[PDB]
């Protein structure tokens, strides 16, 4: 039987926010 999953959705910047949450601050650099 074909159980089609549900279409989960996210905000436009959601992927960028996840990728950003993946990385920490650079301790040896001056601010961006």
């Amino acid at each position: 039987e074909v159980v089609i999953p549900k279409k989960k959705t996210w905000d436009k910047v959601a992927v960028l926010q996840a990728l950003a949450s993946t990385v920490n601050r650079d301790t040896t650099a001056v601010p961006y």
Partner: protein
């Protein structure tokens, strides 16, 4: 001032130094990489002031550690293929119609592309409820869109500006073709 690669440890978190796509920074990349055709009794040029290394689309922001760390955080966004569809044998059984559409990624100010409106519907006639006369009429109506070898009817729509409109038009064309294949005019009798 001294480059900050002197302060970078041998066990640092490299992805935090290059989070996103960035140009080559010889003061940030702690590698003694050289590039350039050497002169006679010369060496390839050093990185500081090297325009050739600056011209490379470097992948310092995508290292295997960084890629794995990215793809572990992105798993939250994914859904699962219905396991009942194990192969194309069942993908062509439970879902007879196939809709092909294309997106184009160039570089510039305008994202528009005239070729993205095209839609291609593919359906096997054996998967439609057609009798002998209905199938004969449908084949004669469509013409070259029907390929005898594959038993596939391929309707390509690009008339409308948008892509949803071309998809709706392809569906409408299929509907009307089926209905006019199942219909026998008075005139048909003279074959």
């Amino acid at each position: 001032l001294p480059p900050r690669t002197e302060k970078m440890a041998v066990d640092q978190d490299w992805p935090s130094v290059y989070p996103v796509a960035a140009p080559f920074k010889p003061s940030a990349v702690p590698l003694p990489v050289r590039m350039g055709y050497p002169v006679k009794k010369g060496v390839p040029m050093a990185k500081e002031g090297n325009l050739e290394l600056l011209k490379i689309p470097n992948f310092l922001h995508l290292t295997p550690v960084a890629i794995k760390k990215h793809c572990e955080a992105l798993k939250d966004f994914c859904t699962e293929w219905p396991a009942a569809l194990d192969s194309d044998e069942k993908c062509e059984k439970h879902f007879p119609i196939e809709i092909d559409s294309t997106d184009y990624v160039s570089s510039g100010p305008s994202v528009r592309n005239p070729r993205a409106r095209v839609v291609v519907l593919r359906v096997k006639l054996s998967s439609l409820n057609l009798d002998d006369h209905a199938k004969k009429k449908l084949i004669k109506l469509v013409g070259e869109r029907y390929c005898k070898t594959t038993d596939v009817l391929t309707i390509k729509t690009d008339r409308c500006p948008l892509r949803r409109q071309n998809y709706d038009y392809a569906v409408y064309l299929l509907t009307v073709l089926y209905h006019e294949s199942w219909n026998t005019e008075e005139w048909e009798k003279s074959k």
